[PDB]
């Protein structure tokens, strides 16, 4: 099934948001219960990002799938980047944001599309590993372009993140 | 794409100095007379190799170690000394680390060791993949940067000599059969510590 | 007779070595996603260009974009790029520049992709010109028109991709070749209360014919002496 | 025509001394104690090889370098010293030139290097075609005599020794796989400088 | 190839613009060099008019191809009509603008299209003639409807004129 996280709001001063997997799904119903009840597990992820923006809204969003997104565990809500709490242009690892495109990524340009999809295969140094104390994948959404809108209405654009597990395997029931 | 000299093997399999080991023989006189130092094998001591390896998340490679030993007479007029013999022992991961010159760890019951004679061609050993996982993990987000790799210890096995000698061992590590996975962007800030902290 | 190369360690040496741990149970490999054979895989990946390097817009997020609508604008190059990926600061920090920093020589074509991020209702035209090597970058719209150029339309089309061909007398040139400049064509027209401060993004990547030789050391992060 | 010993390979592939390198170890006392000198590889230092190569405009060949090291005790009664180890590093074209004994250029991150032990057979290395064009240009009329060729640096990697030692390294270059184009007449006047100026 | 002239701006008080061919292309790179280097020549023209107007803009533009557009040589920029400097409703020849549709023409109605194309065959009393002292064709763009827009943004609509020669023949090199 598809599990929808809490909706974040895009502002004109937002520095970006980041999430960790399967950390964000630890309390997401059946999948969270299974990952909590088993010592070892393996499952892929399908990431869908929806931007509820009108035709008069400006800006771009950069969704990056970073394996082993080490930062120099909020859960469902994740965290936000810091302008000067990881640094947005340093990508949380002292690396210029321009080179962050090496990871699998999608670009959400409000003038062309309002949604994007990503396929995240299982990535780890082991065939099977614990689903609780290890973060297999990380989702980072960055404001590649500042948010702007007509001086008519609205101030915050809602952003919906939906993650659906796939190829789920579980062993070591406890 | 295509073309040689740009492959992963060509990019990574290059010899470079990674460690310097200081050893003594006898007659401390006024110094601590360190007979061994022991060095944990890691790629964090060289910025170039560290940056090359940080380009990817998971990697597999074999390590070839070359040891160059240069001896020096501390006093020019101590007298001719007998030819020095050096013992270089590879400590596998999980094995005890030597703490004394004449402890049980130097008996080479299960620790590979090579004896080098001064004037001979430099010693060379090959260490295969000694990792516990299926690939070395340069990044780990959870509760793996210390990817084992064992350690190296060098000591002097010569008898008690009145003369004072100091020897320096240069360790060169050349990766072999390098395979990489999950490309990562290059580091853009100077390194501070063994982690990913930035200032 | 003792001669160089005999009984001496060589940096680029290649022979067989004694096995420290014979008959060791090496862990079999697994199909880890993202296997890479050659370093050229990273050079073909699109990388955002730091473009507008300014004193305010340095080591930050605003440098990656250039505002595309001023009040009265000008007939001058809004942005200019030099075909020196290993020398231009706008391209040295990119993935292609980082890859080229490890190699003295390079060859092959280059790919530049430009996309602007604005409203669907914004309409206009832009002029993108390529200066041949050895020619000064155009200082006006007419000078850009005198050479190789394309017309980029602001509207349904939102991205423009241009490929710089390999033009060099030698097979490989040192990492120590023309200019790319953009010009306003007519104007930028927006409807009622539509934001007039939209932004553009630039990307640079290598082509399939890219190749390098004579691997060297990198300049970034050097303290060992 | 015909007959052997007159071919281009026979004419050019002959060993000859092209450079002499002076190195020291420690204890300057009253001298500058030059630990390295660095030599740019070129054929202008030997009149015979220069004249042979000037017979043609374009040439392609591989260079084989042989290093002979002879050490000398400055003072006859300083005492026996440990066996000397010399590091010979080849600097590829476009690479930085070493300026200090313990700088980053001596880490051999990408510069090929060979370690020579005193008493061993002379070191021997082979440098392939490292030119940027399709052939070396002995003449260039416009805005190419400096046909790269890299450079060689030799230093002593032994530790601090009170005794004073001086070593001389003789560099012999033997061209291999020599091919020539565009024959030119022989030089008829003595050489003045690295150009074609005559008086 | 396609040669783009300087962009003119549509206002609410614009009386129209006019151009002469091959007068407008006398300095347009290779074609201008060829027409200057040859005493005689012959070539057709392809006229494309682009109006960068939004969906909220009102008005219409009339593009007319007039052979031998005699007026009772600016070059690239051409000229503008005069309300009371040819007269717009007199079409520069003392003729009511309503009858100007007899010439080949296209109508650019902002509510239906924002571009138009025209094919101009070679028209003259001689098979071949000089390309410098004779104006073979004239391009006239007239504001059939006054320009109007919402009281939100913009005041000037850019207009792009692109002319591409065809069936080029040149003789009498000098």
From TrEMBL, chains B, D:
Subcellular location: Host cytoplasmic vesicle membrane; Host nucleus; Virion
Top-rank taxon: Viruses
Functional note: Protein 2C: Induces and associates with structural rearrangements of intracellular membranes. Displays RNA-binding, nucleotide binding and NTPase activities. May play a role in virion morphogenesis and viral RNA encapsidation by interacting with the capsid protein VP3. Localizes the viral replication complex to the surface of membranous vesicles. It inhibits host cell endoplasmic reticulum-to-Golgi apparatus transport and causes the disassembly of the Golgi complex, possibly through GBF1 interaction. This would result in depletion of MHC, trail receptors and IFN receptors at the host cell surface. Plays an essential role in viral RNA replication by recruiting ACBD3 and PI4KB at the viral replication sites, thereby allowing the formation of the rearranged membranous structures where viral replication takes place.
Family, as annotated: Belongs to the picornaviruses polyprotein family.
Quaternary assembly: Interacts with capsid protein VP1 and capsid protein VP3 in the mature capsid.
Name under which the protein is recorded: Genome polyprotein
Gene source species: Poliovirus 2
Residues of the full protein shown: 648 to 865 of 2207
Automatic annotation (TrEMBL), chain C:
Domain Picornavirus capsid: 25-177
Subcellular location: Host cytoplasm; Virion
Reported function: Component of immature procapsids, which is cleaved into capsid proteins VP4 and VP2 after maturation. Allows the capsid to remain inactive before the maturation step.
Membership in a protein family: Belongs to the picornaviruses polyprotein family.
Subunit text: Interacts with capsid protein VP1 and capsid protein VP3 to form heterotrimeric protomers.
Protein name: Genome polyprotein
Organism (species): Poliovirus 2
């Amino acid at each position: 099934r598809f599990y929808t996280l809490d909706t974040v709001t895009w502002r004109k001063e937002s520095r970006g948001w980041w999430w960790k997997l399967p950390d964000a799904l630890k309390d997401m119903g059946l999948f969270g219960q299974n990952m909590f009840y088993h010592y070892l597990g393996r499952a892929g992820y399908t990431v869908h990002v929806q931007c509820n923006a009108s035709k008069f809204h400006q800006g771009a969003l950069g969704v990056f799938a970073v394996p082993e997104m080490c930062l120099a565990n909020p859960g469902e809500k994740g965290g936000e980047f810091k302008g000067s709490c990881p640094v947005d242009y340093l990508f949380g690892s002292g690396v210029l944001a321009g080179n962050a495109f090496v990871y699998p990524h999608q670009i959400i340009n409000l003038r062309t599309n309002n949604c994007a999809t990503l396929v995240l295969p299982y990535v780890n140094s082991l065939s099977i590993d614990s689903m609780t104390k290890h973060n297999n994948w990380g989702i980072a959404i960055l404001p590649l372009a500042p948010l702007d809108f007509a001086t008519e209405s609205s101030t915050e654009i809602p952003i919906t993140l939906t993650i659906a597990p796939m190829c789920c395997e579980f062993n070591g029931l406890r | 794409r295509t073309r040689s000299e740009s492959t992963v093997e060509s990019f990574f399999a290059r010899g470079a100095c990674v460690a310097i080991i200081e050893v003594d023989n006898d007659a401390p006189t006024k110094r601590a007379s360190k007979l061994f130092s022991v060095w944990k094998i890691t790629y964090k001591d060289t910025v170039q190799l560290r940056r090359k390896l940080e380009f990817f998340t998971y990697s597999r490679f074999d390590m070839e170690f070359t040891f160059v030993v240069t001896s020096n007479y501390t006093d020019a007029n101590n007298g001719h000394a007998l030819n020095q013999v050096y013992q270089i022992m590879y400590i596998p991961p999980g094995a005890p680390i030597p703490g004394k010159w004449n402890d049980y760890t130097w008996q080479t019951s299960s620790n590979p060791s090579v004896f080098y004679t001064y004037g001979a061609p430099p010693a060379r050993i090959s260490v295969p993949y000694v990792g516990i996982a299926n690939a070395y993990s340069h990044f780990y987000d959870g509760f793996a940067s210390l990817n084992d790799f064992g350690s190296l210890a060098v000591r002097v096995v010569n008898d008690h000599n009145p003369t004072k000698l100091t020897s320096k061992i240069r360790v060169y590590m050349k990766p072999k059969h390098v395979r990489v996975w999950c490309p990562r962007p290059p580091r853009a800030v100077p390194y501070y510590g063994p982690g990913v902290d930035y200032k | 007779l003792n001669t160089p190369g005999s009984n001496q360690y060589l940096t680029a040496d290649n022979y067989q070595s004694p096995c420290a741990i014979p008959e060791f149970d090496v862990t079999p490999p697994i199909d880890i996603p993202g296997e890479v054979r050659n370093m050229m895989e990273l050079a073909e990946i699109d990388t955002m260009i730091p473009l507008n390097l300014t004193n305010q817009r340095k080591n930050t997020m605003d440098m990656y974009r250039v505002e595309l609508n001023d009040a009265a604008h000008s007939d001058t190059p809004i942005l200019c790029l030099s075909l020196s990926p290993a020398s231009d600061p706008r391209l040295a920090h990119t993935m292609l520049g980082e890859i080229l920093n490890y190699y003295t020589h390079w060859a092959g074509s280059l790919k530049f992709t430009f996309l602007f991020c604005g409203s669907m209702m914004a309409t206009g035209k832009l002029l993108v010109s390529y200066a041949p090597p050895g020619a000064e970058a155009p200082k006006s719209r007419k000078e850009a028109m005198l050479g190789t150029h394309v017309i980029w339309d602001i509207g349904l089309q939102s991205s423009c991709t241009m490929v710089v061909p390999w033009i060099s007398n030698t097979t490989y040139r040192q990492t120590i070749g023309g200019y790319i400049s953009m010009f306003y064509q007519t104007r930028v027209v927006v409807p009622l209360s539509t934001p007039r401060k939209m932004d553009i993004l630039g990307f640079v990547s290598a082509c399939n014919d890219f190749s390098v030789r004579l691997l060297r050391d990198t300049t970034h992060i050097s303290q060992e002496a």
